Scaffold this active site. Structure first.
Site, short mmCIF file in Angstrom:
data_model
loop_
_atom_site.label_atom_id
_atom_site.label_comp_id
_atom_site.label_asym_id
_atom_site.label_seq_id
_atom_site.Cartn_x
_atom_site.Cartn_y
_atom_site.Cartn_z
N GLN A 18 0.86 -1.22 0.00
CA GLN A 18 0.00 0.00 0.00
C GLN A 18 0.88 1.25 0.00
O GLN A 18 1.92 1.29 0.67
CB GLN A 18 -0.95 -0.01 1.21
CG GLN A 18 -2.37 0.51 0.93
CD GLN A 18 -2.58 1.95 1.35
OE1 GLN A 18 -2.96 2.22 2.50
NE2 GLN A 18 -2.37 2.89 0.43
N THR A 27 -3.99 4.99 -4.85
CA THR A 27 -3.12 3.84 -4.46
C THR A 27 -2.78 3.01 -5.70
O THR A 27 -3.68 2.54 -6.41
CB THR A 27 -3.80 2.94 -3.40
OG1 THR A 27 -4.10 3.72 -2.24
CG2 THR A 27 -2.89 1.77 -3.01
N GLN A 28 -1.49 2.83 -5.94
CA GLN A 28 -0.99 2.13 -7.12
C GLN A 28 -0.02 1.02 -6.73
O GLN A 28 0.36 0.89 -5.57
CB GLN A 28 -0.25 3.10 -8.04
CG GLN A 28 -1.13 4.05 -8.83
CD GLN A 28 -0.37 4.73 -9.97
OE1 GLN A 28 0.52 4.14 -10.59
NE2 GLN A 28 -0.73 5.98 -10.24
N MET A 43 -3.52 10.91 -2.94
CA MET A 43 -3.34 9.47 -2.72
C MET A 43 -3.35 8.65 -4.01
O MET A 43 -3.78 7.50 -4.04
CB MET A 43 -4.39 8.95 -1.72
CG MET A 43 -4.21 9.47 -0.31
SD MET A 43 -2.63 8.96 0.39
CE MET A 43 -2.95 7.23 0.75
#
Ligand SMILES: *[C@@](C)(CO)[C@](*)(O)[C@H](CC(C)C)NC(=O)[C@H](Cc1ccccc1)NC(=O)[C@H](CC(C)C)NC(=O)[C@H](CCc1ccccc1)NC(=O)CN1CCOCC1
Ligand SMILES: *[C@@](C)(CO)[C@](*)(O)[C@H](CC(C)C)NC(=O)[C@H](Cc1ccccc1)NC(=O)[C@H](CC(C)C)NC(=O)[C@H](CCc1ccccc1)NC(=O)CN1CCOCC1
Ligand SMILES: *[C@@](C)(CO)[C@](*)(O)[C@H](CC(C)C)NC(=O)[C@H](Cc1ccccc1)NC(=O)[C@H](CC(C)C)NC(=O)[C@H](CCc1ccccc1)NC(=O)CN1CCOCC1
Ligand SMILES: [Cl-]
Ligand SMILES: [Mg+2]
Ligand SMILES: [Mg+2]
Ligand SMILES: [Mg+2]
Ligand SMILES: [Mg+2]
Lengths: 196, 222, 212, 195, 222, 204, 228, 125, 195
Positions: free
Chosen positions: E1, G1-2, G107
């Protein structure tokens, strides 16, 4: 790792790259993954460096003790000892070993032992992360009863491709030739094999 | 830690920095990371400090008893075998990462051991948090057929790379030279390139500054 | 933190410590934990520093706007309810506050409201708020009477903070005293625990657990 | 279990211990004595995990009683406390540790002094003028810091103790159904029946 | 994450005198065990005799300094070039920080300057906007090393007059700019010795009625 | 539930001209609750002094264990144990519990009676020796003690001057830590006299 | 988120007396699979700036498009687009730094580490770093990934501080860079032998070298190493 | 949304829509308020062109805004309901936040503010 | 919060509610009134999550008071209970639901009958002769099953209620600091000051 062993007319040849890694760092670029368990029984090591070293040391001890009592062991016997260790300790081991040896009765033989500890006798074997990329190539190009020079080229061209595609493989290509003549060590440097 | 080992003409040299850390805190500014296993077999240890000291002392002890038992000078491969089988048995829970070097009746030798029990052979090796800074230097300047003075220069330069570029490494450079046919020379604080500058002020307090509640003579005698 | 405020014959005493902590790190020994909202209103701070500091100064701006709009000083009840309705809107978001809104008005008299970050709002005579509240309660309850003099009430408030400052690891620094009368609030000094503890020990004869 | 207190004064040690035994949403008993006599001049109160408490207390009691018979002699409070500490110190690194906290109040007949020892389940021992286990300390310690003097009588100590119980009964969330109080002095151990 | 935060190390220090105020900070910038820069300043002249540093996660620090600098600019535009007082700056910064209460700037912020009576002033902030004026504040990685030394030397804590039976405290007095710079330099050399993330260079910004001066000193580079 | 910081406490040691000093705070608590202000963390076995921070039950256990071992040493050796030798004994004993360790931070201090040389040493919880010319620190305010000692310390301080330096190091470090304080004790140690002083410090 | 899929490894660089040098290999890795070999990770903007990018390659190609579009937008209603009002290295960097931080703050980061190397209009050397977190810094030498651990120690032996920059020629500087690339090929498991190098000089301008190879490698000592 | 500015200034400085709204008030039934020493009285006219009315159920002219405040009006009946409703809601809202009923000045100020808002808002009369 | 009870008798509804407000290990207040008057003949007691309880109670109070002013008429207890239920039924599928349980006691002036409604935080409504929320029911229901009769007087109901509080004070783990009792009948709402 990219490792392989190939039977041929006069016996068998083992082949391996020389790369050891911690993640993406190369801890050792000149590793020797081809190891002696007996005069003319050698193995290729893939998986955990620690596990395969510990196993190979134990097997060498067993075959030395075998030789003291019963004389030269067969290549099958060596593969059986490798199996016994790998199978009975399958929960605590990450070891993919190829066993290769030269008898005078049985000539060249190759046994592969994957993670589970199963034994498979084959004409030639491939293993290690980099082997995946050459299944197609090796199947198409392998022929039974090759000559020494043909087998050396087969291994050199195969590991060259494995090294090219697998990041976990590289460095030099070491080889070990097992025949009635004796034991010969070969090395091949990047400048040669990269431009094949 | 930054630790290195380099092979030369007539033997082998190992080196190390002298910083001991406690998270981001420097606990010891001049600790000794070079350990004696036998008179002519020395050890450089990175990783868990108590584990490297303890494992080196245990194998050193067993090597002495083995030497006395066999009436022979100890071999590097014996120490190497005993260390790796011990570490392997504990499955990496003993966090000792060692560079083992020395001379013996067989010749000069250089090995590294990792916590899980795997061993490597080489002419030049580096371990620890500063091993990448050190290995960069070793890969740039190392050649075959080094002299004694060239190997010391190369080893210390590889440690210096760690000292300056790795936050885990610092202070001084310890060296140990193991040449064939000669006594091993341990060079404690071979380089001291991090001397503390004069302070701007003396913090000597006037006598009586600290408030005291009770005084009493302590009895140490019987 | 340890903060208290109690109601009595002569008005309201308000006492706080001055320590701020980040884990076991003592970050400050000189933090003002009483917020002066106007000459008649005080606000105490416990919990998250920024949360309390930010929203209690904001509360002051809302009270100023009330007296500009209504031409009359805001009641303690209304002031406390502005703060409590605000934090209720953020309920669940993670605000951390234990506050006490103290003040005197004509219609109410001396009044203390407990307001916390899960939206609880309580009127009452005695409240202790903070990590060392129980230590303060122990001394305060056992010595509290409604008929206390202004002098004695100031001391008891001071002595209760000292009790908590001593035992609670996350309380200390110095004691800040405040007296709230019909005429407004009066500041009764900053009292360093360094000197105050020994002074109280010697003069009162208490704290026999400590090596003299 | 829950509330156990102890106060050492000039000539005696006073132990107060709650009477309630609660399990789930039911108070099963309101007259439980959370103490054992280890020797004629040594008393141990205890609190903690169900079952463990009484099992540990009685095990200590048996050992001290065994010692007394063997040597025809009473161990000092200091000696008993050290034995108890070591047993808990062993326990904490066992497969299943005793989760028990104790106070040991005794009168040393050789020194003619009362002694109070506080020992938690980890085996952490301290000699104290006054002691408590669990949440009880968070109220009582600061109260005793203020009102306690080292030269107090047994009667002064009981009044000091009434002050503690009153504060607990005012501010504690749970109903602990009052306390059983016992006194340890030169004449041995006796229980106060009206508290 | 994905983790949106990081730690860039370093430490900062602010002291206030009678008619001046200093705000120091080391020039080292790190991630994990690597050095990024030996000279990357994080103490900034923001105008109106206000110096500022926001230490911790550099990306948030730079964002904050950038926003405050911009706040000063718009204060001039909206209020007829009025000088922004240090106390007003402090309150404005609280609102910048608390504006991101539920996704905070990961920094310790310190500002320095002169108050409206000409006297030296230092304000310090937590990551979400709580603030307090002080004579003295250390911030960042080595704050826990430096701060107790400052309590002892600036605010004369735990120091009593000799012979007075620990009854009379050592009196408080303002320190000269010379004496303060001595303390700053000693504070950072000490911090450099024992903390791995501190070193390379020290940059001090002094603030008097005449303006903002700079001084630079070398620090150990290991 | 971090064993080393439940109870709290600190220990520091220094060297001087023909002398050594070792000091410790007196607090014993249970997280936020202060429980005792008489809990000394320094012990001695002959002329060798040992300070121990960390989990209080292990502090007590180790003291009793080293008293045990030094008493048997003296009976068999017919002499007092020296600081260098004792340091090795502590290291061996801690590492014996490698995978179930005592949660402590011990510090050795003493003057060798044969050579007259001042000696200090520190350890981690599993036995790593940390030797120093100057100073050793341990406990919940170790970061603070490192900062105080690094700035205040100079070499070859007379016993009287050394007392001031070590006391100021401990006091100011303790005041910046919530779990340390509540009183302090300093031991000045010369070749054949040892003075023990209790310091006046803030009690919060 | 990646999570990054096709990635590029180290980018290395340094200053010298008259300008700056930057280099990066031509590999596009797909985990352990060395998938793509013709990937250019140095992207020139004008004749005075080169942007070197490591990390996710899809995001690299997005950034390529942004820079390309930036050049177009700057040319709009700008008679001095090839003169005084041309794109400076500092303008290009600050734009990217802004974007990287904004994306981390939403994000949803561009999974990259970026080094902008160039020369300003007044002759001053420009060399600054920025990554997925929005973290920025400058130094005489800068490097990403494994370059940070292995190249910087070698390049810092040439230029250790500011005063060492005038004393460092383009020959000495390029030698060090080429050496560093060899070391990375020995030791980085996700590196290739083929790389690109770029020089931006205040006098000779932008020189872009393609299809370079690591050479003069020491492998001979491997034959002597037997067993473990 | 319907945006038209209906209430706007004229050349002489008058807002005719506001002034014409006053004419609607002038048409409405008379209402009177007188405050004594201790009371207030609200009187209201009811036109007698409507016989056969049911006075039980017919909306009363005086409305309670709270238990202590009342509101009478003159003008459009339907318009008055909207103001009364808003006033009643604000009355309860004041009790809820200030913990005290509205003053008569405050309640008036609110109602007057609502009326003003409709004199410079688009789309409304 | 914690204990709220309700008993409907012949001519009235009686609501008892605990006085304690606890937070952590401290009883912050021992005189808290956990009820709001919705209308002259309708009373609502409440218990649950801190903040939510009073916020919800006052919000309902405002709405019912608004209705009364608008229509110059008092809603029936049945009508009020349905309104309250629907508000909770909406709430349970909101982003952040009200965690509040209520009892609504009222006297319907049109029917001349007392009425008691029990509504939980989910919006589950039931009319009952006697009701309780939380753990209180586990003791009181079985007790009332035995001793309750439908034709009881208000005085008989209070004695029945004393029996419940005594049982709770004997067997409940927590000290809830007694109860405030209120009666709802034809003459409206009044508080019993001595209980
Ligand atoms: C190719 C590379 C893959 O098939 C070959 O098979 C070779 C075989 C040779 C060496 C005989 N395999 C490896 O090089 C092997 C890859 C590997 C890694 C992890 C588990 C299994 C296989 N590499 C290793 O064994 C290295 C050798 C060291 C560096 C000398 N060891 C590690 O990477 C250790 C292994 C830990 C371990 C895990 C599971 C079983 C046994 C051992 N890993 C680390 O140290 C992790 N490291 C900690 C610090 O953070 C970075 C990661
Ligand atoms: C370079 C400098 C850094 O990598 C070297 O590798 C050196 C090797 C030399 C010193 C032999 N490594 C260290 O200095 C090493 C770094 C480290 C830290 C933590 C885990 C592994 C490695 N430092 C240490 O080992 C110190 C030695 C002290 C300073 C004398 N020890 C610790 O930091 C211990 C680690 C103990 C440990 C326990 C269980 C598993 C692994 C390690 N940690 C503590 O003391 C922390 N804590 C303090 C409060 O008390 C409880 C423990
Ligand atoms: C007594 C004294 C202790 O409980 C009181 O309750 C006081 C109240 C006074 C100060 C108004 N409370 C505190 O001291 C309070 C306790 C606390 C801590 C953290 C969260 C909630 C409550 N402490 C703080 O608010 C400190 C005060 C600073 C350090 C002077 N601030 C922090 O801990 C900040 C901000 C915390 C935070 C809240 C919400 C979102 C993000 C962060 N955190 C840091 O500064 C981080 N820390 C600093 C040390 O270096 C490591 C990083
Ligand atoms: Cl290997
Ligand atoms: Mg490859
Ligand atoms: Mg305290
Ligand atoms: Mg440093
Ligand atoms: Mg303290």
């Amino acid at each position: 790792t990219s490792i392989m062993a190939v039977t041929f007319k006069d016996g068998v040849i083992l082949g391996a790259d020389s790369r050891t890694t911690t993640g993406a760092y190369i801890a050792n670029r000149v590793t020797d993954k081809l190891t002696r368990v007996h005069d003319k029984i050698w193995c290729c090591r893939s998986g955990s460096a620690a596990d395969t070293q510990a196993i190979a040391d134990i097997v060498q001890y067993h075959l030395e003790l075998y030789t003291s009592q019963y004389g030269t062991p067969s290549t099958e016997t060596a593969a059986s000892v490798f199996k016994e260790l790998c199978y009975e300790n399958k929960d605590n081991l990450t070891a993919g070993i190829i066993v290769a040896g030269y008898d005078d009765k049985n000539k060249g033989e190759v046994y592969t032992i994957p993670l589970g500890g199963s034994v498979h006798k084959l004409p030639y074997a491939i293993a290690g992360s980099g082997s995946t990329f050459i299944y197609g190539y090796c199947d198409k190009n392998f022929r039974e009863n090759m000559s020494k020079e043909e087998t050396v080229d087969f291994i050199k061209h195969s590991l060259s491709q494995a090294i090219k595609w697998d990041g976990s493989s590289g460095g030099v290509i070491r080889m070990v030739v097992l025949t009635a003549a004796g034991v010969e060590r070969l090395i091949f440097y990047p400048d040669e094999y990269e431009q094949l | 830690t930054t630790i290195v080992g380099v092979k030369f003409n007539n033997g082998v040299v190992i080196a190390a920095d002298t910083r001991s850390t406690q998270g981001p805190i420097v606990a010891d500014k001049n600790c000794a990371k070079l350990h004696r296993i036998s008179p002519k077999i020395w050890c450089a240890g990175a990783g868990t400090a108590a584990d490297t000291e303890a494992v080196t002392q245990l194998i050193g002890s067993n090597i002495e008893l083995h030497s006395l038992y066999t009436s022979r000078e100890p071999r590097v491969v014996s120490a190497l075998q005993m260390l790796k089988q011990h570490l392997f048995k504990y499955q990496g829970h003993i966090g000792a990462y060692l560079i083992v070097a020395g001379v013996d009746p067989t010749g000069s030798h250089l090995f590294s051991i990792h916590a899980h029990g795997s061993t490597d052979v080489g002419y030049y090796l580096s371990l620890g948090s500063g091993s990448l800074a050190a290995m960069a230097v070793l890969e740039s300047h190392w050649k075959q057929d080094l002299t004694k003075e060239e190997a010391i220069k190369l080893a210390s330069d590889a440690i210096q790379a760690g000292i300056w570029n790795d936050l885990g490494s610092g202070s001084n450079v310890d060296v140990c030279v193991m040449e064939i046919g000669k006594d091993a020379e341990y060079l404690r604080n071979y380089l001291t390139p991090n001397v503390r500058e004069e302070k701007q002020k003396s913090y000597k307090f006037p006598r009586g500054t600290t408030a005291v509640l009770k005084e009493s003579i302590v009895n140490i005698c019987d | 933190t340890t903060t208290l405020a109690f109601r009595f014959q002569g008005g309201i005493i308000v006492a706080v410590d001055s320590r701020a902590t980040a884990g076991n790190w003592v970050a400050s020994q000189t933090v003002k934990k009483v917020i002066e909202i106007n000459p008649f209103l005080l606000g105490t701070m416990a919990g998250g520093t920024a949360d309390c500091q930010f929203w209690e100064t904001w509360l002051g701006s809302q009270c100023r706007l009330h007296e500009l709009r209504e031409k009359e000083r805001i009641s303690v009840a209304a002031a406390s309810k502005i703060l409590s309705n605000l934090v209720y809107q953020y309920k669940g978001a993670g605000l951390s506050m234990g506050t006490m809104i103290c003040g005197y008005t004509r219609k109410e008299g001396p009044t203390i409201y407990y307001v916390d970050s899960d939206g609880t709002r309580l009127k009452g005579d005695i409240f202790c708020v903070g990590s060392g509240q129980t230590f303060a309660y122990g001394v305060l309850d056992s010595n509290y009477k409604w008929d206390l003099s202004v002098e004695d009430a100031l001391y008891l408030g001071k002595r209760s903070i000292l009790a908590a400052a001593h035992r609670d690891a996350y309380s200390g620094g110095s004691v800040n005293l405040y007296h709230v009368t019909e005429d407004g609030w009066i500041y009764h000094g900053n009292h360093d625990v360094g000197e105050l503890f020994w002074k109280v020990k010697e003069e009162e004869g208490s704290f026999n657990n400590v090596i003299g | 279990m829950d509330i156990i207190l102890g106060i050492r004064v000039q000539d005696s040690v006073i132990l107060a211990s709650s009477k309630a035994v609660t399990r789930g949403i039911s108070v099963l008993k309101d007259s439980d004595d959370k103490t054992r006599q280890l020797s004629p001049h040594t008393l141990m109160s205890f609190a903690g995990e169900a079952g463990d408490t009484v099992q540990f207390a009685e095990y200590i009691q048996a050992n001290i009683q065994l010692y007394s018979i063997r040597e025809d002699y009473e161990l000092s409070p200091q000696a008993v406390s050290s034995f108890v500490r070591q047993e808990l110190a062993k326990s904490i690194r066992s497969r299943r540790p005793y989760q028990v906290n104790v106070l040991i109040g005794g009168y040393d007949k050789k020194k003619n002094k009362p002694e109070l020892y506080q020992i938690d389940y980890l085996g952490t021992k301290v000699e104290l003028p006054y002691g408590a286990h669990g949440y009880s300390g968070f109220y009582t310690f600061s109260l005793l810091d203020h009102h306690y003097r080292p030269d107090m009588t047994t009667e002064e100590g009981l009044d000091l103790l009434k002050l503690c119980v009153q504060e607990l009964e005012k501010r504690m969330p749970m109903d602990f159904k009052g306390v059983i109080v016992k006194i340890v002095d030169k004449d041995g151990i006796r229980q106060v029946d009206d508290f | 994450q994905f983790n949106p935060y990081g730690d860039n190390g370093g430490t900062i220090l602010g002291i206030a005198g009678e008619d001046f105020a200093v705000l120091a900070g080391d020039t080292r910038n790190i991630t994990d065990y690597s050095i990024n820069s030996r000279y990357e300043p994080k103490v900034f002249d923001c105008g109106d005799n206000i110096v500022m540093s926001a230490n911790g996660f550099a990306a948030d620090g730079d964002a904050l300094v950038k926003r405050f600098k911009n706040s000063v600019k718009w204060y001039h535009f909206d209020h007829n070039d009025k000088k922004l007082s240090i106390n007003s700056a402090a309150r404005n910064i609280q609102h910048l920080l608390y504006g991101k209460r539920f996704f905070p700037y990961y920094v310790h912020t310190i500002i320095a300057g002169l108050d409206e009576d000409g006297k030296g002033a230092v304000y310090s902030f937590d990551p979400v906007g709580s603030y307090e004026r002080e004579q003295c504040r250390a911030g960042g990685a080595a704050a826990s090393l430096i701060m107790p030394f400052l309590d002892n030397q600036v605010n004369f804590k735990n120091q009593y007059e000799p012979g007075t039976n620990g009854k009379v405290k050592k009196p408080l007095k303002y320190l000269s700019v010379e004496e303060v710079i001595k303390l700053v330099r000693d504070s950072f050399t000490s911090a450099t010795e024992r903390h791995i993330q501190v070193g390379d260079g020290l940059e001090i910004l002094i603030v008097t009625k005449d303006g903002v001066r700079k001084e630079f000193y070398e620090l150990k580079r290991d | 539930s971090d064993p080393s910081s439940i109870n709290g406490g600190i220990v520091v040691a220094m060297t001087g001209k023909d002398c050594v000093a070792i000091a410790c705070d007196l607090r014993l608590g249970s997280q936020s609750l202060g429980v005792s202000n008489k809990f000394e963390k320094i012990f001695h076995y002959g002329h060798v002094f040992l300070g121990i921070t960390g989990l209080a039950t292990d502090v007590t256990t180790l003291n009793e264990m080293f008293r045990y071992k030094t008493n048997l040493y003296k009976l068999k050796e017919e002499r007092a144990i020296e600081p260098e030798t004792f340091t090795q004994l502590v290291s061996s004993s801690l590492y014996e519990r490698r995978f179930g360790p005592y949660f402590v931070g011990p510090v050795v201090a003493g003057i060798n009676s044969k050579s007259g040389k001042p000696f200090i040493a520190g350890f981690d919880l599993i036995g790593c020796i940390d030797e120093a010319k100057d100073f050793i620190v341990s406990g919940t305010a170790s970061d603070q003690l490192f900062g105080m000692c690094e700035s205040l310390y100079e070499p070859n301080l007379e016993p009287e001057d050394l007392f001031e330096t070590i006391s100021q190091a401990l006091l100011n470090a303790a005041d910046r830590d919530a779990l340390s304080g509540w009183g302090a004790v300093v031991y000045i140690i010369k070749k054949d006299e040892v003075v023990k002083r209790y310091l006046k410090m803030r009690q919060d | 988120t990646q999570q990054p899929i096709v990635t590029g490894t180290s980018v290395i660089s340094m200053k010298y007396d008259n300008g700056v040098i930057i280099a990066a290999d031509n590999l596009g890795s797909y985990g352990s699979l060395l998938r793509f070999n013709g990937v250019e990770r140095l992207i020139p903007v004008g004749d005075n700036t080169v942007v070197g990018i490591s990390g996710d390659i899809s995001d690299m190609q997005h950034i390529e498009r942004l820079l390309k579009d930036l050049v177009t937008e700057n040319a709009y209603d700008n008679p001095l687009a090839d003169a005084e009002e041309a794109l400076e290295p500092s303008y290009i960097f600050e734009y990217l730094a802004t974007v990287m931080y904004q994306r981390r703050s939403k994000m949803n980061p561009l999974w990259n580490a970026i080094i902008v190397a160039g020369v300003q209009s007044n002759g001053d050397q420009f060399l600054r770093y920025v990554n997925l977190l929005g973290v920025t810094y400058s130094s005489p030498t800068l490097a990403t990934g494994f370059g940070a651990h292995m190249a910087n120690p070698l390049l810092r032996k040439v230029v250790d501080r500011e005063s060492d920059i005038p004393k460092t020629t383009v020959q000495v500087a390029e030698e060090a860079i080429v050496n560093a690339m060899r070391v990375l090929y020995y030791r980085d498991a996700r590196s290739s032998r083929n790389f690109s190098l770029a020089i931006i000089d205040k006098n000779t301008g932008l020189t872009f070298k393609k299809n370079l190879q690591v050479e003069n490698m020491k492998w001979d000592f491997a034959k002597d190493i037997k067993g473990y | 949304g319907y945006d038209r500015a209906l209430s706007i200034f004229s050349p002489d400085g008058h807002i005719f829509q506001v002034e014409y709204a006053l004419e609607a008030v002038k048409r409405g039934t008379c209402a009177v308020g007188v405050k004594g020493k201790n009371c207030v009285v609200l009187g209201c006219e009811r036109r007698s062109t409507l016989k056969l009315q049911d006075t039980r159920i017919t909306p009363s002219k005086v409305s309670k805004i709270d238990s202590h405040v009342v509101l009478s009006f003159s003008g459009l009946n339907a318009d008055s309901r909207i103001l009364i409703e808003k006033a009643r809601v604000e009355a309860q809202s004041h009790r809820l936040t200030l913990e005290d009923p509205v003053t008569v000045e405050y309640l008036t100020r609110y109602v007057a503010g609502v009326q003003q808002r409709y004199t410079q808002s688009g789309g409304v009369r």
